[PDB]
Nucleic acid binder design. Sequence first.
RNA 1: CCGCACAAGCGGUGGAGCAUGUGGUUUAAUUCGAUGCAACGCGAAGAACCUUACCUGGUCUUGACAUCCACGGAAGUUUUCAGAGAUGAGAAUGUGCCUUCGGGAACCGUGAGACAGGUGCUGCAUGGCUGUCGUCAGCUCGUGUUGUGAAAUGUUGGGUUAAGUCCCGCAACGAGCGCAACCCUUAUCCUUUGUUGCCAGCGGUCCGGCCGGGAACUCAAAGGAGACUGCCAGUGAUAAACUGGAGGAAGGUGGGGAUGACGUCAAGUCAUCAUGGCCCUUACGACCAGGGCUACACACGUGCUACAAUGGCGCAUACAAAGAGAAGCGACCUCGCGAGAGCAAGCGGACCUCAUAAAGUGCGUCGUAGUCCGGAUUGGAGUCUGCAACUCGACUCCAUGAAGUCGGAAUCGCUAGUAAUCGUGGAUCAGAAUGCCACGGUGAAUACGUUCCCGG
Lengths: 127, 99, 114, 82, 211, 224, 146, 100
Amino acid sequence: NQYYGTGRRKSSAARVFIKPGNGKIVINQRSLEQYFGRETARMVVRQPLELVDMVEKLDLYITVKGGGISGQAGAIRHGITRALMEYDESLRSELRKAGFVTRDARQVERKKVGLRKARRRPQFSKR
Amino acid sequence: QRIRIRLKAFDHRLIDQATAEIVETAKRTGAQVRGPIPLPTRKERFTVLISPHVNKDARDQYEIRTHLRLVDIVEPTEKTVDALMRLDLAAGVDVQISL
Amino acid sequence: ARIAGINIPDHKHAVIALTSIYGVGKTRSKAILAAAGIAEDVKISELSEGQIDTLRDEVAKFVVEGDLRREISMSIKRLMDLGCYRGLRHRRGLPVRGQRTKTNARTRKGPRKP
Amino acid sequence: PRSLKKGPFIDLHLLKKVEKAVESGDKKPLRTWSRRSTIFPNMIGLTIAVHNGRQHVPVFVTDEMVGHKLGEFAPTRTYRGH
Amino acid sequence: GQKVHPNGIRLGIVKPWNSTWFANTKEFADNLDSDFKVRQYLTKELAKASVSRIVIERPAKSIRVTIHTARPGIVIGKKGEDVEKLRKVVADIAGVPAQINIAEVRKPELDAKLVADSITSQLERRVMFRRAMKRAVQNAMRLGAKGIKVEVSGRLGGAEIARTEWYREGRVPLHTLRADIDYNTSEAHTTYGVIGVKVWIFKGEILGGMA
Amino acid sequence: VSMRDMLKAGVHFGHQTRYWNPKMKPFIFGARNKVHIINLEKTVPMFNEALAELNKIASRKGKILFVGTKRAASEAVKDAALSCDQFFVNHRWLGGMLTNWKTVRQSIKRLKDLETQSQDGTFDKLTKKEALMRTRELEKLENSLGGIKDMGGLPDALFVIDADHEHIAIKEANNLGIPVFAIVDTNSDPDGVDFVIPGNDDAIRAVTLYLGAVAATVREGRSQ
Amino acid sequence: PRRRVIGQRKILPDPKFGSELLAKFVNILMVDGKKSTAESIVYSALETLAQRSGKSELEAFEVALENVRPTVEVKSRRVGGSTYQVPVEVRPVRRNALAMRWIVEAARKRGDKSMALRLANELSDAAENKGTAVKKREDVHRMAEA
Amino acid sequence: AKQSMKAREVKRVALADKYFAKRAELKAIISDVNASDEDRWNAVLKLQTLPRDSSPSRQRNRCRQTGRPHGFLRKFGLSRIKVREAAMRGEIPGLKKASW
RNA sequence: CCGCACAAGCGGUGGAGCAUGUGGUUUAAUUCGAUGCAACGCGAAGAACCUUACCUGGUCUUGACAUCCACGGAAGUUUUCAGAGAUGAGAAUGUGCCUUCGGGAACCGUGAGACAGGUGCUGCAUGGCUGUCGUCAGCUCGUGUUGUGAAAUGUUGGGUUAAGUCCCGCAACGAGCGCAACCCUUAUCCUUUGUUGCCAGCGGUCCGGCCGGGAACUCAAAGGAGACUGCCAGUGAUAAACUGGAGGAAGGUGGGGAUGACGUCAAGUCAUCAUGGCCCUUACGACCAGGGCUACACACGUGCUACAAUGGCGCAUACAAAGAGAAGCGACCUCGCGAGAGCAAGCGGACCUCAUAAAGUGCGUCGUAGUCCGGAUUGGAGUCUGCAACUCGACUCCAUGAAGUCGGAAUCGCUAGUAAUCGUGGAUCAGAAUGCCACGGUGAAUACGUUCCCGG
Ligand SMILES: [Mg+2]
Ligand SMILES: [Mg+2]
Ligand SMILES: [Mg+2]
Ligand SMILES: [Mg+2]
Ligand SMILES: [Mg+2]
Ligand SMILES: [Mg+2]
Ligand SMILES: [Mg+2]
Ligand SMILES: [Mg+2]
Ligand SMILES: [Mg+2]
Ligand SMILES: [Mg+2]
Ligand SMILES: [Mg+2]
Ligand SMILES: [Zn+2]
């Protein structure tokens, strides 16, 4: 029936709703392959299903907000995995050891004062 | 027909006693409350040169966070409007009633 | 072929070739081509007189090469001769639009000295 | 350049003195502090002193000077090299 | 090195503000300006009434101030007369209906304002700063503090050098955000000049948030 | 305790003839297999006369401190103290445990404060990691002062096992005038023990004999 | 790493052809976090390798890399009194990395109107074990044993 | 700074206030397209007759406590210092150290 | 023994052009301070006038600002003349309010001196504030013990930790300041409430979340819950701890903040302020105009943009966060090449607006050149702010197209969401960002290690 998983990435958030029956995938009412102008994104979004291999068995209506393309893809993969799990929970072990139930938290660091960036230092002339 | 109530304060605790009082008053008159609804609080940063005169290396950062709640009643009665106008709050808070 | 100007354009795209002529920049070059209704990547070659004539015409509508150089030199000259402030500066070969003579004005000042 | 919708700019007392000189025939090089005024065509073939910041220098106005401001002809700095 | 101002850091944590009025960017600056001025004036007035705190909360149609002091009757005179003239002068320095309130303190030795100003005064008697602050900390601790620390600075004893010093006792955790440290600063105007005094009183840690 | 009662437990056993102290010559029966043999003919009456004094002290409401830091015999000495409602030190004798009494009282107060605080509450107010750390601090204060939390003041009598190992304790006691009752092996210096029991101090069986006999006589002195 | 040795974070393999050594190579060629425009050129070079140098471009990579990946290294240090150009060995990952560096820079050495051409033809020459990357491997082995 | 400067700014404010409407309508007429461009001319002339203090550009924000133009905070109207004072003591309501 | 200390890494600086500071030089004046680390996009979060303290001149002397005294006028409003304005000189109108009528209040004008006034000097007279060592791991105390005592112990030994972190040893024991933790924020979940937010399933829909409707979710923000070496194994005194494993959104102080012990440096600041003392007072005080603070033989730091085909250019097209906004943001529409203009909705704002992110991607294009590179410089012409853009604003348009083809010695920065790149916003602010403080997009490489460098 309707299985939902929530994926978050550096800045993007995903809403993944799966229904058992196909492998078609739609994002914001667009189609993936055309939705993403880079193949690596298509890869990294297929990763979970490409791994559990039940690809053309249940189709996907995913939603995404914020962040750039990589953030989208990360949130997508995460959501997908968290939906697969809530849908079978036999693949829990699988996806975890695959490195998918991580919930990556690497986010950008705030710019700190006295620094040209978050961690970069001004080119001080020691001499 | 909506009686909308925006509350703006500086600490969430006070704004929350405010919302609680509001809704319990609404239930005195049994008005149709939508609850306290938390709205995005607003953040004010200020970086300032704490070091006096030439020193610029020292810097500080302060913030003002305006907490903001929204309540509404779709069904105003008299016992709504009067009592809600008989309502006192701590000076820390701010009310905006729209009809 | 000849554009009625001292310089000779190169066998590159017409807008670039027109830009080579003094007094004709990208805007004016494409605008002359638009008036002639000529395509873009055509170069100076592969284009008959039937177009070169038109081009020499539509550019003769403008002032290019030496005549423009005389006009700019006189505007700078008289401006010097007015004894105006910027006239002074142009007489001294220094920046005339308010830049640091304390430092890094070499583009106008030239090389460096002790 | 300021604009054109507002036209040029010049102090009124400049207009006063300049038209007085005009109607009155030639006068002395008249003293002025406002470098920021604009040179007008009527004011030609005459001269005028303008305070460069420490004194008012003389300048003999002519037509082509019109449009420029009075200040350009009073270099407020002194320099002859290092 | 330079510490951080201990009061400011615990604001909201365990330290309530000294001014509770809310406002908007429109009427903000002038509002706090009025508050500053009335603070200043009231300090001037009660300069002998041992005011420890003056908190100002501004309702939309009124202004309300509360004084933490220890000399209430001093401020009251007979039937809140001087109090009422104060109400007048503050209502008009605020241009808004006033409401004077006074919440005296019970352990004057157990604030940071009163003790510091007492120290300054005795310094103006040219009392031995040493024994003065000694008395101070003895009284505070004997009264029930968990720790006290005083510090005085600048041309001590009329000296021609600014040999500053500090004295400590008890326990004063100046990194534990759980702890109340009543910290107040004051000054004293010697003929020889100005000498600064800072006072911390640690009165145990607060458990349970701002409540 | 009868000479036969001691001998079966092995009270006569001692350290090597290589390792003995000069003042112990009167108490030494002789040597066998390069081993010092303690004389029970002296051991039994001295232990009995010490039991008399211990009974007297406990029969005038005396507080008794059993002292031994051997890793083998720590629990034996602790249980020995518990069997007679007394106080003990079964881990490392801290220097100035008796002479620096004021500091120990402050440490006792912290032990009591932590256990009382956990019962009262506010552990929930503390972070769970902090609450676990507070429990660890309470456990540390228990492993340090489990025996003397309820001693209240300086003890009235000391019982020491292997007086040479615990020499700081006896030096403190003598500095305070608190009497020392100690099992003294041949390698120990007997000057610090006012009622000296020369006997083995390592063997679990003889140590338990000493402790059980002392505790029986202490309960007897308490009963009246 | 004065207290503890840490290295580069473990990477994930390029999904385009399953190889992480591909992923590492592109992260070596990746300029300013511009993955796309980088991996484009590596894919463009490997595809044309896969034809002009026999199939299995994923294997053309190593038939060049083995030709470049040095064996001896020079790690100068004053454990003997001063700077000492001592020849030592490194684990396979280090020589792999040095090979990838040496080819990616050798690529930057040529231009030829496009980066695809540079990288492709130079990886071909390295597969041939002739050129500059392989040659600067020969030279580093030369100076070392000298 | 000098009380002269504080009073100077104060007077500048009080002045430029009273001529608000006049400056307003005058600039209106001037900017106004379709004006006679004579009426615009003498209009700008009349404009400049007003005191130079009338311009808002002359007004420079100053600390209301220490008369300091630099480091001004439009939100509080203080210098970049006295703000810290009334902050660490807790007079600026709801203000506190920011560490996000 | 530590440390981006080096090594190993990447990317720079030093070369060019420009921005910006500083020094020198010049000036009538280029106001003042800041001076190795730890001054030199520093005070200043924003010098056209203003600001501004500098110069030139024009001026005033109880005075621009304050109290007190008189004495006279309501207060004001309106306007003219002279001046560059300060200013004078006027000319009109108003002449108002409490008063128990005597006055007051209210302001303003003249005098009266008390006096006000000083960005005048002394940070070696000070306060306050701040930097610096250094978030360095220390600092010491009670008590005890040893010694006649000056003292010492603790605090040392073995370990171990980011750590005086912790165990063990240990005549010490304990504490307290530190460290840690309590705080902020970020990573999971749950609970609560769901409009302006949201749309899984819902009927209509113009097909736009749009809308009757849904409250699930995404969010929003309050509460909670979670990670502890808790578990397993292996190490090590078995101890501390350590290595690995599990589980887990998270694992070994999760990430980042805030937080700065003593004390050092007569560090810095008397031009924020406060203040000792001194020094000026018809002037070192006060006012206005213009000028200067922007000067150029120079030298030095800091930065920006570049030298190109991972590129430039045309076309097309996707994804952000964080903000701010009412003498404000300003849409829409129309005009204008554009900067903009007109018109004028909307919004004190999950609503309205600023505002469509850029790199990306797709296609074409350019062929290695001083180029379709680079854009300084100069011309021309406009715009907008503002009294006013000459000195000395920003910007648009046209034209012009320098030097530069990766930069010696030397030197700098960083261990990951970092570096490096790409844009967005804010402060200050009429206007004026390559500076500053923020936010995101994309997103690396290296670490054998401690020999050396440097500091501890
Ligand atoms: Mg301004
Ligand atoms: Mg100085
Ligand atoms: Mg000075
Ligand atoms: Mg000094
Ligand atoms: Mg001037
Ligand atoms: Mg300057
Ligand atoms: Mg620089
Ligand atoms: Mg281009
Ligand atoms: Mg090139
Ligand atoms: Mg900067
Ligand atoms: Mg970023
Ligand atoms: Zn023994």
